[PDB]
């Protein structure tokens, strides 16, 4: 269930994003709802450190950018 997908402390943001949207397809609610969820859930459930940077990428940043920001070093 979607509440359970959270980003690992070394899992890169990309692979976490696949898990998330995989799971999200499985659950059955309105497309509308599943979008709301994303909005709450996906950034919030990233590894604590990674959000730090995400926070600084600005609101405008794309996924593409976030995934880049949040792969390792």
């Amino acid at each position, epitope marked *: 269930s979607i509440l359970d997908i959270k980003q690992g402390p070394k899992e890169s943001f990309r692979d976490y994003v696949d898990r998330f949207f995989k799971t999200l397809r499985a659950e059955q609610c309105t497309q509308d709802v599943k979008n709301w969820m994303t909005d709450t859930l996906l950034v919030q459930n990233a590894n604590p*450190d990674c959000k*730090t940077i995400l926070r600084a990428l600005g609101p405008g940043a794309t996924l593409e950018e976030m995934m880049t920001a949040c792969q390792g070093v």
Partner: antibody
Amino acid sequence: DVKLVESGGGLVKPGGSLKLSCAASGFTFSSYTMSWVRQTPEKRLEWVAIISSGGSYTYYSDSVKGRFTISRDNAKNTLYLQMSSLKSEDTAMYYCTRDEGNGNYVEAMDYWGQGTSVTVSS
Amino acid sequence: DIQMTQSPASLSASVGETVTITCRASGNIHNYLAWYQQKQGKSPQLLVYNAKTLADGVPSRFSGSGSGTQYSLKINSLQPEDFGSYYCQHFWSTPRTFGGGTKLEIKR
């Protein structure tokens, strides 16, 4: 009383290497996002690189990507900038900078260092 | 990317006058903009952010205003300590870019 103090500026030859650092006193270091910002001889300011409060995540302006490396020793209350492959064009005052703590996204750079100068020339 | 254009490049006023620097983005920023002050040979100080809100310990003569794509900064009745440089930057998209900067000098 928040402080940022950069150092390590100097003269370096084109395609050389130099490492700037910044000692933060004043606040819980590992609680903030940090940046390096430069100012041209002309005085155009250009944001260069940013880093997670944790440290494991970084991000770079195209203009330095793959040439520069940002890092922090949280225990040493220090932020670093590793420069390699120096263009003459990298000649600037380099400023260490703190992202403000309070907005959902970062809404300002809070504080700045005083800067160290780097001149790259032959 | 989003780009910032400022103007004027420079302007010079007299103590007591009022003055408006502007600032213009290649995209919309929904108010995610900040303004820094730079006095000669010092480093920049944050002065305004989110277009409108003043940083702490910034006298009230400073107002920020704007929305969408054009924003601006205004100083009511100048004091000597206000003369310097002024830069805007945005915080919407990922490269936080800076205005060229508006150089403010004193008339006499």
